[PDB]
Design a binder for this molecule. Structure first.
Ligand SMILES: NS(=O)(=O)OC1CCN(S(=O)(=O)[C@H]2O[C@H](CO)[C@H](O)[C@H](O)[C@H]2O)CC1
Ligand SMILES: [Zn+2]
Length: 258
């Protein structure tokens, strides 16, 4: 039917409605750390989030997302492998039913408990709808989550999740600072890829940070209380909303660090 993460509408089915699922630059991928090549020509990442304006938090039926005002150059990603300025639009997560899975990218086949995606679009294309039609339209900053100590910066997010339990629910979510979700190091891998959900458009420069953030078991367990379903429908926990690693094909993963 309409796509999802279940047995009958999961990642293995997506190619039927979205044939680009089997394309030449699909995401996520396994990051083979010994094969990634250090590229000394990569500029450092510029993450400028000091003026970020969060608007709302939303259960969109496949994850939850915090949305930002992208009508001007407030929160932007620059440098690294990127040319030009990319505006922060939203962030969301992918996570598992258990701590041993949940991430979309993997590192030497290692799966993390979850993965955070900060989604930015290239301002030269004017709006995100136009950007997703371009090979360099989007830049997604991917951050791994492992389970251990709590991430204080994440707690304001986890505390309102019970108010957006089911598909379509949203809440005001102002004055959230996404800087509290970043690890210490901005060391990264980068490769050309795609959206990891339908329409799987091949429009993304992926920037995946080497250093995971630690979140607590209690924080992740609140992720797993969300529902795929709308209210009044049979309750199906929002867990394992991750696409597995896709063939690397004719691509090279570059590292910003030795
Ligand atoms: N998981 S992922 O790799 O981060 O995938 C993306 C990230 C962001 N989108 S999205 O396609 O760019 C984008 O598309 C729309 C316009 O088509 C919307 O208005 C969304 O606001 C927006 O996220 C959906 C999925
Ligand atoms: Zn994502």
């Amino acid at each position: 039917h309409h796509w999802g993460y279940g047995k009958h509408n999961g990642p293995e089915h997506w190619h039927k409605d979205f044939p680009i699922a089997k394309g030449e630059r699909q995401s996520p991928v396994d990051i083979d750390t010994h094969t990634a090549k250090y590229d000394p020509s990569l500029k450092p990442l510029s993450v400028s989030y000091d003026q970020a304006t969060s608007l709302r938090i939303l259960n969109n039926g496949h994850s939850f997302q915090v949305t930002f005002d992208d009508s001007q150059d407030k929160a932007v990603l620059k440098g690294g492998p990127l040319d030009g300025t990319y505006r922060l639009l939203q962030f969301h997560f992918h996570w598992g039913s258990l701590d041993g899975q949940g991430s979309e990218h993997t590192v030497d086949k290692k799966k993390y408990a979850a993965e955070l995606h900060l989604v930015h679009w290239n301002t030269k294309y004017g709006d995100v709808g136009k950007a997703v039609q371009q090979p360099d339209g989007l830049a997604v900053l991917g951050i791994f989550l492992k389970v251990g100590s709590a991430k204080p910066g994440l707690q304001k997010v986890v505390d309102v999740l019970d108010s957006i339990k089911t598909e379509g629910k949203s809440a005001d979510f102002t004055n959230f600072d996404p800087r509290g979700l970043l690890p210490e190091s901005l060391d990264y891998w980068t490769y050309p890829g795609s959206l990891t959900t339908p329409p799987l458009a091949e429009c993304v420069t992926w920037i995946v940070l080497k250093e995971p953030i630690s979140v607590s078991s209690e924080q992740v367990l609140k992720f797993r209380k969300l529902n795929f379903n709308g209210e009044g429908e049979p309750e199906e926990l929002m867990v394992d909303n991750w696409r597995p690693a896709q063939p690397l094909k004719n691509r090279q993963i570059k590292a910003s660090f030795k």
